[PDB]
Amino acid sequence: GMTSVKETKLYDLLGVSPSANEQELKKGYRKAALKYHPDKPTGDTEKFKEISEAFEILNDPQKREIYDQYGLEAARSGGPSFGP
């Protein structure tokens, strides 16, 4: 895909590189899931879900763009949902 995003963290959340292929995503996902697994004492469930969400944002041109423009918080919210 096109890396039209602000941060390449989306790839880091999948444990893959910008030009990663499907095989990379699968193996990286297991690595990332092993990294942000809720078994970790901090209990990062949001980060575990963020793994999939990152790919979903990266795989979706709408949220991909929103990520570039505003960032992850906006992209994951489906837009600049930042009220006063």
Query: Which DSSP string corresponds to 11-74?
Result: HHHTT--TT--HHHHHHHHHHHHHHS-TTSTT--HHHHHHHHHHHHHHH-HHHHHHHHHT-HHH
Q: Is residue 56 part of a domain?
A: yes
What domain range is 71 assigned to? Answer: 9-75
Nearest to 52 by CA among 16, 10, 3, 24: 10
Q: Is residue 4 part of a domain?
A: no
Number of independent structural domains in the chain:
1
Q: Is residue 24 part of a domain?
A: yes
Q: Is residue 80 part of a domain?
A: no
Q: Is residue 31 part of a domain?
A: yes
> Which residues fall within 8 angstroms of residue 54, CB to CB, at 6 or more apart?
9, 10, 11, 13, 14, 72
Q: Is residue 18 part of a domain?
A: yes
Method used to determine the 3D structure: NMR
> What CATH code is carried by the domain that includes residue 18?
1.10.287.110
Nearest to 4 by CA among 75, 61, 54, 80: 61
